[PDB]
């Protein structure tokens, strides 16, 4: 069998799989009081992309299509195209277009457009509320709130580049975004379909290990924590390698390459998430040059050394 | 050193701990995709009541106090008293008054009242929407919708007796109640406090075992499934016995007394919930005289025989 492995990359060398920003740190905490079912950053260890996951980190939380002005307002409806500008097909066996945001919140960015006949261009501040009834990316429809009521042409290529998140600042700080609440991809009162499954630790004393970033904040007092289950580079690497899983669990050691010292060990479950032996909320303290090393296939009953 | 046990009672001889109706059956299913954090039917095996749990089966989802008419409506605000008509104290270390509903839904029942001076009485159809901003039992205020704007008197003892649940038949069938969504006990935009913890299986191949009833439906197409973690009789029994836990897990066998044969075994975790070894949704088929029997103290690493 082709040997399994994970990339030789430090945490800071890698990228969040749920928003186009670098990873910052490792975090673990209990999760029984919320549902951990992100759709980006989902990949089996033998390289099957799940949920809404696609390969490039720069397409995460972007949208492409043409826009229609909602007269009387500064709002525009975008009819979604595929990343390569091809027609988008709502009947594919996915929850939503690949790269669609997988949390409820207010994502701020910039809508840009080029007019093809003369090469004229324009960019405007834009916000997408993924909790809105007009957020229906699975059916190809997303509404943006912008700072213009006139600049954007119809039937011209238009792109949303995400920047960060905002919070209604007259409200209790850090109550949005809600990173563990999936959007309703087809709008109100419509069940999501074809989801990657929710994940949870399934061994005594274990917690999920999260790959954490801080999203930029553009207004108010947002909760900028963003946790993904797999670095985007691991998604990319498993897809490329396609090494078959020999058991349910790949045992990884986090090692300091200067000293060879193992700092902690963790379980990489073959369906694509990581657990550690710890109880409580904890920001891991790691050497900046540390990296993950696959050591052995184990079963689900392996007892990790406490971290 | 007092020996632990569970009562010798069949499933149909016991009572749901989350609504005043008998238990009907046993059910198991995966639970990573929702939060299992009920506040009624919560009790440790050594008899410590948790959440909003109290001992009386008939006080579950009941409210008592005086009512104030909401001028212009057929609605009344009940100013809550304790279940024994004493003053209610919002500063106790509980999430809400004991027996408060622990799910978001529309509970229909009857508001009754007696006039102290002459013994005149009155009763009216009433509904409490536990997802309402005006559902704030932690602060002693609960709004009822009734069919009168003038019959109830001020400063007179008033009781809500629950009957069942309703759904808006003009909307998708079985979309409410939501038995795994806690109310906001202090109203809009206010965090719940002092909750009994969420629960989850913590061993490979295990699922929660649920004690299931069917709530009466009073209108529309409600989801009447109601799952509790412990029968109300087990809450009552553990409270009375107060037997100390000798380990984290009491191993129970479900035995058929007609044959003496064990049908399945399960783990009763000392913090007060049950797991079984099974994968998938399953309605347990059990003999009518079967009951649970405590056999030995084990730990969270014990491998159960497949259910």
């Amino acid at each position: 069998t082709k040997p399994f492995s994970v990339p030789v990359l430090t945490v800071e060398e890698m990228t969040n799989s749920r928003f186009p920003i670098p990873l910052e740190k490792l975090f673990t905490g209990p999760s029984s009081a919320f549902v951990v079912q992100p759709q980006n950053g989902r990949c089996t260890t033998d390289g099957v992309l799940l949920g809404t996951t696609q390969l490039s980190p720069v397409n995460i939380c972007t949208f492409r299509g043409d826009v229609t002005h909602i007269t009387g307002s500064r709002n525009y409806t975008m009819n979604l195209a595929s990343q390569n500008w091809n027609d988008y097909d709502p009947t594919e066996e996915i929850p939503a277009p690949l790269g669609t945001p997988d949390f409820v919140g207010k994502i701020q960015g910039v809508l840009t457009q080029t007019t093809r006949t003369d090469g004229s261009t324009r960019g405007h501040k834009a916000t997408v509320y993924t909790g809105s009834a007009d957020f229906a990316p699975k059916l190809g429809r997303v509404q943006f709130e912008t700072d213009t009521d006139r600049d954007f042409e119809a039937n011209q290529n238009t792109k949303f580049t995400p920047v960060g998140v905002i919070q209604d600042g007259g409200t209790t700080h850090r109550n949005e975004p809600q990173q563990w609440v999936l959007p309703s991809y087809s709008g109100r009162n419509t069940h999501n379909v074809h989801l990657a499954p929710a994940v949870a630790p399934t061994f005594p004393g274990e917690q999920l290990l999260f790959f954490r970033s801080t999203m930029p904040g553009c207004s108010g007092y947002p909760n900028m924590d963003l946790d993904c289950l797999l670095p985007q580079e691991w998604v990319q690497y498993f897809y490329q390698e396609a090494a078959p899983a020999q058991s349910d669990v790949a045992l990884l050691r986090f090692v300091n390459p200067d000293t060879g010292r193992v700092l902690f060990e963790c379980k990489l479950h073959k369906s694509g998430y990581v657990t550690v032996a710890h109880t409580g909320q904890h920001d891991l303290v790691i050497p900046p040059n540390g990296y993950f090393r696959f050591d052995s296939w184990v079963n689900q009953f392996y007892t990790l050394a406490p971290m | 050193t007092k020996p632990f046990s569970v009562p010798v009672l069949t499933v149909e001889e016991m009572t749901n701990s989350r609504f005043p109706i008998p238990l009907e059956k046993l059910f198991t299913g995966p639970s990573s995709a929702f939060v299992v954090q009920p506040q009624n039917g919560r009790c440790t095996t050594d008899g410590v009541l948790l959440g909003t749990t109290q001992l009386s089966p008939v006080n579950i989802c009941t409210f008592r106090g005086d009512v104030t008419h909401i001028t212009g409506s057929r609605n009344y605000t009940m100013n809550l008293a304790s279940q024994n008509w004493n003053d209610y104290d919002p500063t106790e270390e509980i999430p809400a008054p004991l027996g408060t509903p622990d799910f978001v839904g529309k509970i229909q029942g009857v508001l009754t009242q007696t006039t102290r001076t002459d013994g005149s009485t009155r009763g009216h159809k009433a509904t409490v929407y536990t997802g309402s901003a005006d559902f704030a039992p932690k602060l002693g205020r609960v709004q009822f919708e009734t069919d009168t704007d003038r019959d109830f008197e001020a400063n007179q003892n008033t009781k809500f007796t629950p009957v069942g649940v309703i759904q808006d038949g003009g909307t998708t069938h079985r979309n409410e109640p939501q038995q795994w969504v806690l109310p906001s006990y202090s109203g809009r935009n206010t965090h719940n406090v002092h909750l009994a913890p969420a629960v989850a299986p913590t061993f490979p191949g295990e699922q929660l075992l649920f004690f299931r009833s069917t709530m009466p439906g009073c209108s529309g197409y409600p989801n009447m499934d109601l799952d509790c973690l412990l029968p109300q009789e087990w809450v009552q029994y553990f409270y009375q016995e107060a037997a100390p836990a000798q380990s984290d897990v009491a191993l129970l066998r479900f035995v058929n007394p007609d044959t003496g044969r064990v049908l399945f075994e399960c783990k009763l975790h000392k913090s007060g919930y049950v797991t079984v070894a099974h994968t998938g949704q399953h309605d347990l088929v059990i003999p009518p005289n079967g009951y649970f029997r405590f056999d030995s103290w084990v730990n969270q690493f014990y491998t159960l025989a497949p259910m």
Partner: nanobody, 116 residues
Framework: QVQLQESGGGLVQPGSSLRLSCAAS????????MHWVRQAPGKGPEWVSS????????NYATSVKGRFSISRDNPSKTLYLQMNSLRPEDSAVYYC?????????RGQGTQVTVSS
């Protein structure tokens, strides 16, 4: 079991209008997005139209936008496609399809020929 049954196809002149129906059973219908897809002779199936549970979100293939209208009646669990200004290239078998959890379901279809 989930069941979908289309109806209303036939042979019609270019420029005319035609309404297709799809009767659904075996699931709540409400709560689920529904779609129309079509398969022309010698080609694979292609998306035509989509609608969410309440009907407040709809979308259409570029080739039928402005001419087709999708709608639904959830109490009777019926999906509809109103087709106007029909063209020869609209000729195809039309299917209703849905997705529930991680499985897709499609009806047997109804034939529509647009020809003089």
């Amino acid at each position: 079991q989930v069941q979908l049954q289309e109806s209303g196809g036939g042979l019609v002149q270019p420029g005319s209008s035609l309404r297709l129906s799809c009767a659904a059973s075996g699931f709540t219908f409400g709560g689920y997005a529904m779609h129309w897809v079509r398969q022309a002779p010698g080609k694979g199936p292609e998306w035509v139209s989509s609608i969410n549970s309440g009907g407040d979100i709809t979308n259409y293939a570029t080739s039928v936008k402005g001419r087709f209208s999708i709608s639904r009646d959830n109490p009777s669990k019926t999906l509809y496609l109103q087709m106007n200004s029909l063209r020869p290239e609209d000729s195809a078998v039309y299917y209703c399809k849905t997705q529930l959890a991680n499985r897709d379901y499609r009806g047997q279809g109804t034939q529509v020929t647009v020809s003089s």
